[PDB]
């Protein structure tokens, strides 16, 4: 029964079948739990351990490298030797990667947690009801209860389901729907119907939501709905529905890694088409056990080579590192991945109150009627300073200081602003300044009166937890308050009846003193109040009021009016009902109209500013606001949103606006709006999905269960720090401070780590790619291998680890800012930049190939072999080629190997420096320009010594220190590479430019 | 220049290039030094103190424990809780014993000597030289003499190298080469050349040997050898490459701990395998944390429990104890683990004279020729009683005492004893007994003139010291004895050459008086006397003497025979040069035939028993004795290791005789041999060897440095307590009284601890394969830790140690004699004995775990919880199998523990009963059959209820008293092991019997 608001007490008894005075029956009990279920959220899914673990092994290329395992493990099995103190190493290390990699994905499942769980704290244990079986109450748990059953909740009990109140045992009840929102106001609840049948949950007075909590009272009622089919559980299943994309990085990186697969079994190929002529060999002669053996080596090199195996590593250290730097400007991201999405930022909806503004609010100005006159009339506007709660300030008037003593109407109106308030001040002994306690608005009030002192009260003599409410206890003292007539969107007002003070046993005196939105309360006056005198209220003097409330509501002031009257003739106490809200906007009806007060929200001091940098970063601004749209835009004017005179007619709208426009315009409002006012529950969700229609990046900000939906689906659903556990989890970011800047700032480091990121990663692609020549090379020329996987894995490991990390500390570019977001399908590497790493491909394929094919032939200290066949042979089974010797294994020597990977290091080295930007010479971008990267490479290269001279390293990495003349060797090799690139970007800037 | 002796003084001279009146020269000083190296045997390789501590780490089993330590540190470190005063103890305790470990260790290696160093005590300081750079002799550090140089020694003067006597300064030189052998008889020097290149030592009459004492004289010489070239250098190098296996113990518990270490790695893979179910575990949930704690928790456990902590000292002290049992017997063990090797003994090599024989020598026979006539030839044999030195006994022939000085033979016979003699008789005042001063043989001789009395002198009329040499002093008045040709190996005899008393320039009248072997004696008479009377000497006579000189020496007087004889025309006193000892036979040429005298030396009064109680043992006993062959094969026969007429022919060998025989030959010789007589300076060795290669557990007896490399090698080198410190520091035993039936005893005895060692090893061990089941049973069903580290260390090292200990008092087999020596390969558990203790262990495992989890389930005073899924759960994050209550560490509650641990202890106690026998029921073999034991018992029990009573001790480890109804069911779940067991043998008794 879902529709349990609009009916009425007696309805939802009738609907269910059951009495208010038993409760259900342990049949009904049977049977309503069978057709509704048990009262919670479904559990989540399960997923074993093993089953994570296999989950770990889903990847492409974790596939390709555990399949590299087993060929490496069988070959070093099914082997014939007797050094085996490195023969299980290279599969060992291949395998211990994944291990590694399979740790930490595991790791990671067992310390997240989502925000679908998360709404399971709001659901308490146990709750009360009321059933047949019984007289008194009986507890059970909030699992077992079910639509029908008669509740009972009291204060401090957290509501264990949403129930329609019967009725109220105790005076008045309070409950806090914090959860759902944020404003911990407690509101006021009621049993009469609610009759719009759509109502939203704001306005169903009459309801408990469960997972809210009672502040004050005692009622009974009956439980309208349970499950996924509360409020907060059909949050449940809007979140539960939505879809997360990848980042458009792990879309980029996804694709590479399907084509680098698709790519390696086409060198397989390949490198097979080019051994064709194996089939015109003799039937008798060479090893058919030798041949396999070599092309599942190079497979296991091929696989290893184009792998890069620390990218993994290096962009989560750099990660890691930028999110503990986002941490020091008070952005606190929760997902890693959520750096990169963060700088592609298109759009960015922020809610204005705490975020755009300071949410401390100050009355700045407040005008009463000066006389009525016929056709003439004049107001008495006036102003306020003091834009904290602090009682320091002053009244002027014509901008000099008055005493708003002086004026009756001023007392009058500060007697409305005091005893019409829920609210006070109070001085905090640690902060040392007036801290405000309830509403902002009328804490506003508050500070009001102090500084009015409309009866020159002596404060100066208190101290500051005493003046505090100075002024205020005065104003109480010369009326009881009876009761109050809360606020309601419904009238948007709210009253308090007062009584004399210094009375007794009179029949007259009574008064009314209401406060609310101007139009309405307005509406409702049939007199107004000129001193301590009264006068019809007439159309022109009702315009002038109105006038002068639209210059300061939509005018620069960008002001929130408030108008205040008293109903001189309150009707007879005994005539009112307390009881149905319905029946407060009559009671408020024959008003007296006394004044209105202009109260302000100030926006961030940095706001401006940020506002700005988005236009310079193209990227929009999208306000929501519960202001009404008329404020709404003057705000957004205010702080550049919308130019002073610019025309918005199309770019703001209200949610009743909205909502009144076809899916079709709806959609199109989205891409040309920047202010959304008066928005519906459904909204937010319905704008990042027509702005997700036209591709944009964008972020949402929110809190309470009600946003935990919205900031699911944007890309980057946004936090506050005080906002609520849940919104946070749900959230791709949280702001320490609340500060839109925050977000700015976010964005822009975010776009400052991608420009890095892509430069560390096209770093180290790059050099996979040219891994994968040197192994193409040796195999299609049938040379000895020049390079190894365990050598290939320490480079992609460490030694080129340690550089790519440090590429990830690039200084940014000062035009950051200053660029439209970057597009989510923007390649890394693409047209000059690709063929760019082509001829560095083979460049470094061809260095390390000749290098160690080098020391074969021309080296001093080697086997000068020059042009000796190494491709006609390696079999040595004829031994022909070479007459007199016994010689045949010196083939697999460390000393060609050492070269090679002696030359990859350096090269690596090199190319290194031609990272720290994608077009800009070292001669004008110098390397010293990043003192880490040239910290790093003097690190891997001493690194590259240690395994070449700490003995146990050498021999398991099957290598040899190489001659003074060796390494010279290599420098005339390497060093090389550094020219090569800059005239490749020579070639980008000077004839690649339009 | 090794072969010195056989080189004479000139090519000694020659080979060295050094003058005998100047020495050498400071450059030959350096050259021969660089050449030769230093005189000194190498220094012990040293073995630092920090070099040591760390080898008392390279055990498994200290490995395995160190490891647990480090574990339990930290477990007791990365906690949460507050009751540290009993974090630290667990891993302290561990700590701790592996210290007192090393301790004992390190105090070993710092009170220990060995053999090799012993023999730099032979080395002296300095030495005397002659070198060119100086006229007078100096003195240098004997390190410092090198080949070559001509050097020094008067009497008091150690020998410092091995030198070839040049010229002999004083009348005689006489050495004191007892550090070789132990007759302290000095020996004199000559500087003739030894023609022999292969001569013993014992015949280098012309050398020096380094460590040898210069009992007489003053000599020159040149150094010959120097360092490890000397004799005892050699002796060093044979003893230094002698490898010494560990004991059947050492290696039996050495393979215990190899397999228990590979045991425990395989239950923890099994702890493992048997949670394999935890894959599919929820992937949120459960502290990973506590989990891993868990398992390693239990490793701590299960290294604490395989391994039988107190098994080291409970070995110590049974060892320590039976040492000073058997030292009682006059047995001195140096070699606690000798105890038990000595138990195997498999055959035992003893010495004939002063081990198996008194070595107290006495004359019981002589016989001189009564008359001689053509064919016809009688012998005038008689007999002498007194078996001590002491004068007191007398002559008889054909049973009947007559007068020695009726028989002239016999006064020449009696002269010649008396004159051809270097010793004499002492009669001591303390002792009051006659003591010999010299040889034992001549002093017999001495004893016999006494006794004879030839000259009817008045003795009844002196004292005891005063008739001690009375007959012998009335004969040396008759001649003067002018010099004496002493004994050589090479003619086996000696002489003296006496002139006429009361004479005075006479040209006749001289007398040669020669004493010896009878073979070659008697070959150079050429002449009989018979009374005063001689004459040729006949073919048939010479056999009358031979035969009966056979008789006495083969036959059951088993007598040494002495021939004596006068040359009674010895040449002239010119035409002699007492310096060539090499013409002493020609000297001895053309004697007279006087008589021969058989002398016993009496078979220890025990040795008849103890090579029975061998022959009862399987315990082969071998002989071996400087007789000849054939009195030693009646020596044989006469103390029982031969049968009266047996065949013995190839189960006796002289040194000579085994020499002929093939290394192939020599082998099977020693398997068979019983007597070996006249034995190489190189066979105690080859026997030791050749007796190993049979894998017999050989004893070997000995002294003086030649000994030393034998008694190094056999397995249970035995010395004399009358022997040299050398041969007592190479042997495993010292013989305090030096009888050949205290090694017998010993051997018992020693089989008498080992039984009682395999008892109470076989009871721990057993205790620690309980442990571990229970430790097992424990984590594979998931329980709470029954008994933990600080527990299972009191029982293994107090509780258990104590029963163990008083096992090592069980009283012996009476048929422990009666069988063969004991396997080396005997295993301590193997069979059905295995499948007992594995049938206990398992009793144990499921006693002592089920104790505990009774207490949780089935206990008045307990948390009663029958089934309560004790596995499925000890998570208590959730709770909800336990829903109203607010407590789970009740699992951690002292109680369940105390039950586990005194079912251990009380099963422990039980099991100790039924370690007093391997097969035989408590009924047969009664618990009070070792009293020892039971009150072990006792005060076992009396220290488990002190830990339990005593507050410091209940909480430090865990426990808490049981109800009187706690304990009843301890006596429940202990006391049926007994039958158990008792079954259990029933089985190995009625059907394993075959
Ligand atoms: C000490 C504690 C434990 C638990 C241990 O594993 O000892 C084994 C072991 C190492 C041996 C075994 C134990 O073997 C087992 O208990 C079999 C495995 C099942 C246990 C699993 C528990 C859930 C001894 C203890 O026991 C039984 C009952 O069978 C007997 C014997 O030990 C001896 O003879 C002692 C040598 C001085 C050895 O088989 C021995 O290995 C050898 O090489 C021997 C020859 O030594
Ligand atoms: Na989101
Ligand atoms: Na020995």
Partial sequence: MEAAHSKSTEECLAYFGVSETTGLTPDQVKRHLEKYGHNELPAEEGKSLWELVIEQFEDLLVRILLLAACISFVLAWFEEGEETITAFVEPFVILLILIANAIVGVWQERNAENAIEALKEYEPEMGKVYRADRKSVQRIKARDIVPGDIVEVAVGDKVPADIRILSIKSTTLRVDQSILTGESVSVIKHTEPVPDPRAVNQDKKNMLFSGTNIAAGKALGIVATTGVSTEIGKIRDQMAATEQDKTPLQQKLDEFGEQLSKVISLICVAVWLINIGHFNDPVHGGSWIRGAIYYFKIAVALAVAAIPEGLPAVITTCLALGTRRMAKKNAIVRSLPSVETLGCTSVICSDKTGTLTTNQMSVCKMFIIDKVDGDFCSLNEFSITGSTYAPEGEVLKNDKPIRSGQFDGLVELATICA??????????????????????????????????????????????????????????????????????????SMSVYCSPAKSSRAAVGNKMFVKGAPEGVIDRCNYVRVGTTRVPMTGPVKEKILSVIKEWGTGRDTLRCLALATRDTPPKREEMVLDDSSRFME????????????????????????????????????????????????????????????????????????????????????????????????????????LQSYDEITAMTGDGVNDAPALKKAEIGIAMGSGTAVAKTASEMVLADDNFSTIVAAVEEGRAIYNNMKQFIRYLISSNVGEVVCIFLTAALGLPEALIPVQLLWVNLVTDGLPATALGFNPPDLDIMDRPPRSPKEPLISGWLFFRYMAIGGYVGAATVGAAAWWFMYAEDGPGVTYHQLTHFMQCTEDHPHFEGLDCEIFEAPEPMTMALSVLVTIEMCNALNSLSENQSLMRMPPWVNIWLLGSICLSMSLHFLILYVDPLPMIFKLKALDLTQWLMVLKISLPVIGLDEILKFIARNYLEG
């Fill in 587 to 690: 009671y408020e009806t024959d008003l007296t109209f006394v004044g209105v007060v202009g109260m302000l929200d100030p926006p961030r001091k940095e706001v401006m500013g940020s506002i700005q940098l988005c236009r310079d970063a193209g990227i929009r601004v999208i306000m929501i606001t519960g202001d009404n749209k008329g404020t709404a835009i003057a705000i957004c004017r205010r702080i550049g949103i919308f130019g002073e005179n610019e025309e918005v007619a199309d770019r703001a709208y209200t949610g009743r606006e909205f909502d009144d426009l076809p899916l079709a315009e709806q959609r199109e409002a989205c891409r040309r709006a920047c202010c959304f006012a008066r928005v519906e529950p459904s909204h937010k969700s319905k704008i990042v999905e027509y």
């Fill in 419 to 492: 005893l019409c308030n829920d609210s006070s001040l109070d001085f905090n002994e640690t902060k040392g300044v007036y801290e405000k306690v309830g509403e902002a608005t009328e804490t506003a009030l508050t500070t009001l009166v102090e500084k009015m002192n409309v009866f020159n009260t002596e404060v100066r003599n208190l101290s500051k937890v005493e003046r505090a409410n100075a002024c205020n206890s005065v104003i109480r003292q010369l009326m009881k308050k009876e009761f109050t007539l809360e606020f309601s969107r419904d009238r948007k």
